[PDB]
């Protein structure tokens, strides 16, 4: 019953440039002169995608920027170079004997020049304060890094409880990340306030990013 | 050319045996070994078993020897699967996949049928309209937004235009809390294009039947 022990488990690299990920089973995975070792692309929402068979066979309809090597136990996935849709968590499979054993996975993220969020407030709905529920909510758009600090401020005073976070996947054109921010509250508590912020602490600036709105206006 | 036919989601009872299906085409289903994958959600992958249609002779991982049982019907080319006794261990995508001919790789795949094991209730979801702040545009965009509130199970699709508006769009990940989804998704277009063009979200939760589109007003 064989381990396969996957490094690293997530790998930043730039475009253009080389990946590689490996593998180590716990026993040999070859039978007469083949290595039973195969790769695997996973994209979010998809199946695992097959990159490379038997070690080293470029799957069809799969670009030659992939390649694998290796034989016994230890084994080498290659993508050379980068380009912006290899986002993905990436699996090793062996094939030599059952239970059929998977790789923990590596993640790719891609490297790519520092840019600034677009921040975007949202008072709630007309419809949603018929609920007496209400939401805020903030988008930060297209940034990177991924590191990103929000901060929700009531009538000029910061609050904690009551928010909850939301992150996209790494965009697979443009490398960037987003997130949406919301602060529900009761319709009640809503309406005993009349300014609302969301600010945004990023890499790209040493001043936050303040959007904001007073009720009513 | 081969197709593996797996239905995209199932609501189960905690306890309750469900039945997951794998149809088959584009090939003959008698001569492939067929195996099944579960994957836990943001997890890695397991192998639970495999099945030779033209005989029915099976392979379990030891892992899922009284949780598993695999069938095939060889007239309708449909593989099964039965979770006995389910529980929210239970809950996952499960895959299924069939090797290449003359080969031990897995090469074709289904989209996995996404299992909820769970008691709760299944919910409809609201859609509120986010439109922009008060006061003039300043900058070349506009961003605009649709927030989907306290649904109950997954999935929920979400479009924007009947889908004709598909760039510069975020739909983000659901969150759970108690037992209710919350999604919300936003679009940014050219500050010249509305509100002279219409901005619509339309929005699907299958499990309750509902199909809204909203209209983002000023």
């Known amino acids: 019953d064989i381990v396969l022990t996957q490094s690293p488990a997530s790998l930043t690299v730039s475009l253009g440039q080389r990946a590689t990920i490996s593998c180590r089973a716990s026993?040999?995975?070859?039978?007469?002169?083949?290595?039973?070792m195969e790769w695997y692309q996973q994209k979010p929402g998809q199946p695992p995608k097959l990159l490379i068979y038997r070690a080293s066979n470029l799957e069809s309809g799969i670009p030659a920027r992939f390649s694998g090597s290796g034989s016994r136990t230890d084994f080498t996935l290659t993508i050379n170079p980068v380009e912006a849709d290899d986002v993905a968590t990436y699996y090793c499979q062996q094939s030599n004997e059952d239970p059929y054993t998977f790789g923990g996975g590596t993640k790719l993220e891609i490297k790519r020049a520092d840019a600034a969020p677009t921040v975007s407030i949202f008072p709630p709905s007309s419809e949603q304060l018929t609920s007496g529920g209400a939401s805020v909510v903030c988008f930060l758009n297209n940034f990177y890094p991924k590191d990103i600090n929000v901060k929700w401020k009531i009538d000029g005073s910061e609050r904690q409880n009551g928010v909850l976070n939301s992150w996209t996947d790494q965009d697979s054109k443009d490398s960037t990340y987003s997130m949406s921010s919301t602060l529900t509250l009761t319709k009640d508590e809503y309406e005993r306030h009349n300014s609302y912020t969301c600010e945004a602490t990023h890499k790209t600036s040493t001043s936050p990013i303040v959007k904001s709105f007073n009720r009513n206006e | 050319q081969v197709q593996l036919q797996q239905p995209g989601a199932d609501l189960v009872r905690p306890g309750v045996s469900v039945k997951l299906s794998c149809k088959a085409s584009?090939?003959?289903?008698?001569?492939?070994?067929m195996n099944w994958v579960k994957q836990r959600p943001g997890q890695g992958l397991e192998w639970i078993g495999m099945?030779?249609?033209?005989?029915?002779?099976?392979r379990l991982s030891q892992k899922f020897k009284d949780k598993a049982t695999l069938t095939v019907d060889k007239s309708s080319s449909t593989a099964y699967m039965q979770l006995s006794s389910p529980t929210s261990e239970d809950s996952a995508v499960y895959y299924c996949?069939?090797?290449?001919?003359?080969?031990?790789?897995?090469?074709?795949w289904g989209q996995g049928t996404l299992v909820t094991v769970s008691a709760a209730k299944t919910t409809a979801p609201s859609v509120y309209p986010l439109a922009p702040v008060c006061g003039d545009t300043t900058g070349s965009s506009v961003t605009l937004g649709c927030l989907v509130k306290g649904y109950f199970p997954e999935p929920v699709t979400l479009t924007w235009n009947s889908g004709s508006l598909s760039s510069g769009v975020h739909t983000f990940p659901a969150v759970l809390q108690s037992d209710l989804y919350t999604l919300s998704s936003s679009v940014t277009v050219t500050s010249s294009t509305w509100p002279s063009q219409s901005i619509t979200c339309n929005v699907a939760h299958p499990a309750s039947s509902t199909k809204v589109d909203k209209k983002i007003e000023p």
């Open positions: 996949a069939r090797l290449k001919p003359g080969g031990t790789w897995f090469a074709y």
């Open positions: 026993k040999s995975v070859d039978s007469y002169g083949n290595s039973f």
């Open positions: 099945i030779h249609p033209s005989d029915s002779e099976t």
């Open positions: 584009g090939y003959t289903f008698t001569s492939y070994w």
